[PDB]
């Protein structure tokens, strides 16, 4: 659903200041060769050749590590999240956007992303990048840029008397559709989204139900960095498999449970399901080398185990006796 909601006059100066702060000290850049882009990490290649270099140079710089979390290993993500929650003393807010790529306006697209790319890249490459942006208007970096712009707008609205550089220095971790911010702008974020024309969903941090971030649940971010898959999103749908019909059910289930072990080995109410899938569909599945040579293969802390159990129960609103009964039923099947 395309939208053409231009922002107000005042917000334009805030957006320009945010873009300039994003530029930082990297005035000049050069495009990457086709071979280097191909070995990095059709239609994706032509934009990737420039966008990967732009991200790696500007968005992964010294003065842009405060907010651009997108682009780091999951261990690095967990470390950053724990550091941010320690800094904010467990006072953080979560942002959940609905169809951001389908809702970003033309003015935002042509005044944030296009401006940033043109300022980052060399003048001799202006025509190619502008043509690529025009083709885009009619991937990953766009969401991060939108999140950074919205964070800058919120910070500018919260403290209009501070210098833009100091305001932007407080930008918390942001990664695409998910991000973190101070809880003091919980109500003012909705007005900023309305001014830009975006829809924002915000939820106050609650230790009883855990914290939601990148479909990951932090059981107790104050002390431990233990983290698990989001139970709210996956439990209601994990019993149904959305793989293509051509794949046997056993191979898809095996890949799903292998990923779950790789990410959620010691999570209550999921380990039992994964083990029962491995016990039932496991022997009936095909050879694992066969599925490793098949395209659809990629189409999918012990100390606080008690606390993780209680946090999962709080997340799923299931009584402990009910949880034990469910665990017994799952294991005995």
């Amino acid at each position: 659903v395309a939208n053409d909601k231009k922002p107000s006059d005042r917000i334009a100066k805030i957006a320009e200041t945010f873009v300039k702060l994003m530029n930082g000290p990297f005035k000049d850049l050069d495009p990457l060769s086709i071979e280097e882009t191909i070995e990095r990490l059709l239609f994706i290649l032509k934009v990737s050749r420039y966008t990967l270099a732009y991200s790696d140079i500007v968005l992964h710089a010294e003065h842009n590590e405060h907010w651009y979390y997108p682009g780091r290993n999951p261990t690095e993500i967990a470390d950053g999240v724990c550091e941010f929650v320690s800094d904010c003393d467990a006072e953080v807010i979560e942002t959940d956007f609905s169809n951001l790529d389908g809702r970003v306006s033309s003015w935002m697209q042509r005044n944030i992303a296009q401006k940033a790319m043109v300022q980052a890249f060399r003048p001799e490459y202006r025509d190619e990048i502008i043509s690529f942006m025009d083709t885009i208007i009619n991937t990953t970096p766009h969401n991060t840029q939108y999140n950074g712009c919205v964070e800058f707008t919120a910070l500018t609205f919260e403290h209009p008397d501070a210098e833009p550089e100091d305001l932007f220095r407080l930008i918390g971790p942001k990664c695409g559709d998910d991000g973190l911010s101070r809880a003091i702008i919980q109500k003012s974020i909705n007005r900023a989204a309305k001014c830009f024309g975006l829809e924002l969903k915000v939820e106050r941090y609650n230790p009883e139900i855990g914290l939601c971030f990148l479909s990951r649940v932090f059981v107790d971010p104050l002390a431990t960095t233990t983290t698990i898959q989001d139970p709210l999103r996956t439990l209601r749908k994990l019993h149904l498999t959305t793989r293509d019909p051509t794949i046997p059910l056993a191979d898809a289930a095996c890949d799903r449970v292998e990923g779950y072990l790789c990410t959620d080995a010691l999570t209550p109410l999921i380990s039992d399901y994964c083990k029962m899938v491995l016990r039932l569909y496991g022997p009936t599945a095909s050879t694992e080398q066969v599925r490793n040579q098949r395209r659809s293969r990629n189409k999918e802390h012990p100390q606080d185990a008690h606390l993780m159990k209680q946090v999962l129960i709080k997340r799923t609103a299931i009584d402990e006796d009910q949880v034990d009964a469910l665990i017994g039923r799952f294991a005995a099947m």
Partner: peptide
């Protein structure tokens, strides 16, 4: 005048 200036400025910024 402010609106026109904003429009032309954002156009010239987008074109680079």
């Amino acid at each position: 005048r402010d609106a026109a200036r904003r429009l032309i400025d954002e156009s010239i910024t987008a074109v680079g």
